[PDB]
Structure formats: structure tokens, C-alpha cells
Design a protein around this ligand. Sequence first.
Ligand SMILES: OC[C@H]1O[C@@H]2O[C@H]3[C@H](O)[C@@H](O)[C@@H](O[C@H]4[C@H](O)[C@@H](O)[C@@H](O[C@H]5[C@H](O)[C@@H](O)[C@@H](O[C@H]6[C@H](O)[C@@H](O)[C@@H](O[C@H]7[C@H](O)[C@@H](O)[C@@H](O[C@H]8[C@H](O)[C@@H](O)[C@@H](O[C@H]1[C@H](O)[C@H]2O)O[C@@H]8CO)O[C@@H]7CO)O[C@@H]6CO)O[C@@H]5CO)O[C@@H]4CO)O[C@@H]3CO
Length: 87
Amino acid sequence: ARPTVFRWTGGGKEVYLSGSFNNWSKLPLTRSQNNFVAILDLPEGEHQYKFFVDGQWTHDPSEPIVTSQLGTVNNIIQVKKTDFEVF
Ligand SMILES: OC[C@H]1O[C@@H]2O[C@H]3[C@H](O)[C@@H](O)[C@@H](O[C@H]4[C@H](O)[C@@H](O)[C@@H](O[C@H]5[C@H](O)[C@@H](O)[C@@H](O[C@H]6[C@H](O)[C@@H](O)[C@@H](O[C@H]7[C@H](O)[C@@H](O)[C@@H](O[C@H]8[C@H](O)[C@@H](O)[C@@H](O[C@H]1[C@H](O)[C@H]2O)O[C@@H]8CO)O[C@@H]7CO)O[C@@H]6CO)O[C@@H]5CO)O[C@@H]4CO)O[C@@H]3CO
């Protein structure tokens, strides 16, 4: 598993990260310089995720997206051979 950085740049007061890698629970993100951020160790390969921003499910329009089998929009990224890549 490689350290991987998630960064929400869309603002807000309170932000959670939800994705396949935490079974779609809600991880509190840390405010840092107008970002909200978290760092997770993730195995190489695909992950889907989304944000929960002041009470509302939101994706990041600047990362790739896909429609899930539930019929919802997630971000989709590919963890590769780099430590602390920012998504
Ligand atoms: O919780 C896990 C989950 O979280 C994230 O989803 C959130 C999402 O981003 C939000 O937008 C919001 O979703 C609401 C949405 O906006 C509304 O449209 C509505 O959803 C309706 C759909 O429009 C409509 O498609 C229909 O859905 C039916 C499906 O067509 C059908 O396929 C089936 O769904 C089942 C799947 O086939 C199955 O794979 C399994 O789903 C899993 C996913 O594959 C998986 O990615 C993950 O889902 C994430 C998700 O990707 C995030 O975006 O977890 C799933 C395991 O549970 O299970 C399905 C059976 O439940 O069934 C449904 C109908 O039963 O109907 C809905 C009307 O509800 O409502 C949304 C509010 O719930 O919220 C979610 C988090 O709640």
C-alpha cells in the first residue's frame, strides 16, 4: 500500500472522504490552506470515491468520473508507483 493524498479544493466548512477503500464510510478531512486533505495508504490499482461537503454528496469535477452500479457519480483514480501522489 502506497501513501496517497486526497485534496478537496471546492471549499466548504466541513468535508468527509468516502470511497471503495473505506467501504463508503465518511473520513473527516483536515482543513489546510483552503484545501481539505487526508493521506491514506492504498494498494495500487483503481479506487472510486466522492466527497461529502456540508451535508451534500459531491464529486470533484477535475478528476475522472464514472457512474457506479447504484446509478451515482464517483471520482475514479488509479494509484500507481508513486508515494504521496495528490488526487
Ligand atoms: O453507500 C454506498 C455508495 O455511496 C455513494 O452513493 C451516494 C451518492 O453519491 C449520492 O448521490 C446519493 O445517491 C442518491 C442518488 O443521487 C439518487 O439518484 C437516488 O438513487 C437512486 C438511483 O438514481 C437509481 O439508480 C436507483 O438505484 C437502483 C439501481 O439502479 C440498482 O442498480 C440497485 O443498486 C444496487 C447495485 O446494483 C449494487 O451494485 C449495490 O450498490 C453498491 C455500489 O455498486 C457501490 O458503488 C457502492 O455505492 C456507493 C456509491 O458508488 C457512492 O456514489 O455501494 C453499493 C452497495 O450497497 O447495491 C444496490 C442496491 O442497493 O438498486 C437501486 C435501488 O435499490 O434507485 C435510487 C433510489 O434510492 O438515491 C440516492 C440516495 O441513496 O447517496 C449515496 C449514498 O447514500
